[PDB]
Design a protein around this nucleic acid. Structure first.
Lengths: 100, 62, 92, 88
RNA sequence: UAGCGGGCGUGGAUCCCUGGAUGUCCGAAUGGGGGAACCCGGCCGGCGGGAACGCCGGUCACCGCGCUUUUUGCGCGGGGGGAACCUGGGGAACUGAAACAUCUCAGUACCCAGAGGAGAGGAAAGAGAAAUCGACUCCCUGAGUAGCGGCGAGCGAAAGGGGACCAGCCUAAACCGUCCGGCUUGUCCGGGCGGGGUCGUGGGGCCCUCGGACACCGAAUCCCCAGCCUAGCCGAAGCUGUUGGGAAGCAGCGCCAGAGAGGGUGAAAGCCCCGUAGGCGAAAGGUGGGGGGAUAGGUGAGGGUACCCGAGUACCCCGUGGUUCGUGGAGCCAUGGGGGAAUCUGGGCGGACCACCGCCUAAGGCUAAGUACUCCGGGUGACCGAUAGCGCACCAGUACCGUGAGGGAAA
RNA sequence: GCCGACCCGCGAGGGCGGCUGGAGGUAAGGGAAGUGCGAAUGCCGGCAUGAGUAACGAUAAAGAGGGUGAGAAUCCCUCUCGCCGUAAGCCCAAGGGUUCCUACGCAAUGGUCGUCAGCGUAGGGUUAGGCGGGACCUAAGGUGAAGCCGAAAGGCGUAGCCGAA
RNA sequence: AACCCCCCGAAGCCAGGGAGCCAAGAAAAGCCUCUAAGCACAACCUGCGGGAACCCGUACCGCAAACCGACACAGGUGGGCGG
């Protein structure tokens, strides 16, 4: 309940820290820890292979779970907070003056 | 969505319902042991199968 | 609640020695009768079972770190098939 | 015990021993004891058969009202104590 | 709770809420047994050729009350649990008296039984000096007063006043109809049921008269509804640069505010996030005279009659308790033992007792509210911050110690 | 938190400077306390002393060659020697509760060692009409319709029932 | 493979053996039999062929290093064999 958060898998900007300004397509929200992932955070995992199966595991520097309060969505502008208006039928989200 | 499909046609399972239902679940548990067996040898079972099987039985048993 | 007593094949070197005769052996339910075992396996493999045997298995206690625990207990049963016939599935 | 119509238990009220004038004074030595009811048995016919009653003398007669009352009262069918219960 | 190994969801999952479903065996444990979680059964139907075996489903403990003619049946209900609180049944000693008996500690501790969200208490045989207050419960006060006390230690009321709350009823009995039972068939005794009746300006019954009535009075009972609890949604307003691993900081200029409580965001954010203030929300279960409606039940005068009005009770005495009252001039309420009335030209009480004068209707019963409590949920703190705070922030009533009750960590 | 020989205060103290540290601190003036420790054979935890000391748990007794292994007096094999043999051998019951076996290993456990184990991980292992017990019987005793007793809780107790080396 | 002969010979077995003694030495069921109810198309007894026969313990230690003594504790533990 209420674990529902800012947004889902889509186009989201980052006003975080070391990646202030980086904007990418977020490919995974994990509501269990309040952290998302874009293309930004990319720490190098020196480790060999995460799971014993398969040869070497590559120095994969893949995206690292970022805290969600450091990510703002965006549409015909540059990322607003998310108010929510309603139709004659269902309901979705409209930003500070735009749509979608 | 598996639910939708199964349940509806179990009240469609009313051409000879109760009697037939008893029979139905009986064969279903067989399709169960066969699995638990295959999931004992090792390479012959990919999880879920066993699970979803049981969960159907769960509803069927109504 | 018929195919429910036979839990799974007991897989061990020694169990395999029982295939040489009609002496198949597998993991059965805790509270189960040599009488309802015969009936069960018979209606589970359509083979007449002369002799039946159940023994009990206390599950060893294993420890996973500072947390100590106990594996379930089991009831091994060995069956005896009407002299000759066999179980195609267990012969594997 | 108490039992019958009597409806009287066993009070554990205490008894103190005194030494005195009373036109000189008075003093003591006290302890606890329990007082009991004059319970006795009551044999009586009633309906058929016999039936015992364990009451205090205070109310024995009150048993002997019950008996003239079970006369406009229907009671038979081999009722040993059933009589007593149905005795009001 | 990651990994192996696989699957699911905008044909709208996960998750949350209401209800329904399955719910092994132990445990009030309830077929019997039993060393709790395990053994062994009776009957009915079914399963496997299934008679021997086995298994499945249902059913079979005991006690109480009412129908059942006894009989066997059927029906409603009890059994145990509960942190604390509550009533009743029992009931300590240390201790204080600077010893120690009365006394105190105290009707506390604890044991027991029973009660419920409360419990108890309750329509005056009241209070007590005002020809006056007027059920009960609790708070404040009266008041450390009256008083009790080896008049030592110490113990300690009540009315009245102030406030919370508000609330009043049904019956037993005289009498009448009825069914049944008995028996010395009576113009009657009893039992069941119904009618009748419920009082302290006394009431009721019975007969007569009035007009005896459309009217009044009205639930603690019943139905509907609001509201309400059990999941939730809307929720205003910020950008740039600068120091930095990281700003929310420093700075420039803006903005919302029924919202600048609080919390998170890599540091110090009204404006990013969750919220906050304001306002919306229930198919379902639950709740509910706060509102409406209905019913159950209730309402009149005079006169005559002399019927009725709670029995081993009142009352007296002996042994007792409660009370401020420890036998004191010892009443009253309560009652173990003995004797033992009256139906209002009656009985109690007003502190031994008598007279007058006043208060009151025992010996039947029920009653909401105010009240206590804190397992439970929420709020807050001149409360704790890991030797503190619950014993337990942590896989703790665990490890471990004890036969056992029980004790009991660290982290 | 560590540091000082500086500054101030009679002092308890305070301030400043360097260092460590990494997210809190809380003026002036007042306010309220779980408010200042060296002793309580105090409580709790940590660590010293004794001390490289006693001891290493039976005076039945060992030596060697070979092997394994990072490492061997201590594991494995062979030989020689010793001790038990009314037991220090072999069974059964009670109590133990996986300590049995196989593979892998040695931080700890082993009063040393340790390649070994009863220790760590994992897998395997206990088969019954005839043995033992229960769907047989009773004993002491217990339970307990009825019954008798007890302020309650309960006490006794026939029948039946549970009760075995 | 042999697997024979001779001998000692038990507290054990035949078992409910025999003797003597006083201190006078469990209960119940199975086992037999009698009869009542009750049935006598049953039932019981005899043989034969076939069919049916559950639940539980079963490892290992068990005079000890695995039980009781806080311990691989010189202590403690009942019964049988023990050449």
């Amino acid at each position: 309940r209420v674990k529902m958060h800012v947004k889902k898998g889509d186009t989201v900007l980052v006003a975080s820290g070391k990646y202030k300004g980086r904007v990418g397509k977020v490919k995974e929200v994990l509501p269990k820890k309040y952290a998302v992932i874009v293309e930004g955070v990319n720490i190098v995992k020196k480790a060999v292979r995460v799971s014993p199966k398969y040869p070497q595991g590559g120095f994969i520097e893949k995206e690292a779970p970022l805290h969600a309060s450091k990510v703002r969505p965006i549409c015909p502008a540059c990322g607003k907070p998310t108010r929510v208006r309603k139709k004659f039928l269902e309901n979705g989200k409209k930003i500070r003056v735009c749509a979608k | 969505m598996k639910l939708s499909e199964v349940r509806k046609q179990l009240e469609e399972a009313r051409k000879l319902s109760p009697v037939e239902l008893e029979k139905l679940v009986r064969e279903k548990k067989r399709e169960l042991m066969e699995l638990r067996f295959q999931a004992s040898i090792g390479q012959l079972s990919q999880n879920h199968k066993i699970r979803d099987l049981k969960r159907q039985i769960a509803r069927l048993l109504t | 609640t018929a195919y429910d007593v036979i839990l799974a094949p007991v897989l061990s070197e020694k169990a395999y020695a029982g295939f040489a005769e009609g002496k198949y052996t597998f993991w059965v339910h805790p509270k189960a009768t040599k009488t309802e075992i015969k009936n069960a396996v018979e209606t589970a493999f359509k083979v007449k079972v002369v002799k039946v045997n159940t023994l009990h298995v206390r599950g060893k206690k294993k420890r996973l770190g500072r947390y100590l625990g106990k594996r379930p207990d089991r009831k091994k049963a060995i069956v005896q098939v009407a002299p000759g016939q066999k179980i195609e599935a267990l012969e594997g | 015990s108490g039992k019958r119509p009597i409806v009287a238990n066993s009070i554990q009220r205490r008894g103190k021993a005194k030494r005195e004038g009373g036109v000189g004074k008075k003093t003591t030595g006290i302890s606890k004891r329990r007082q009991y009811p004059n319970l006795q048995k009551v044999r009586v016919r009633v309906a058929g058969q016999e039936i015992t009653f364990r009451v205090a003398a205070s109310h024995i007669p009150k048993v002997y009202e019950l008996v003239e009352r079970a006369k406009g009262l229907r009671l038979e069918g081999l009722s040993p104590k059933e009589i007593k219960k149905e005795l009001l």
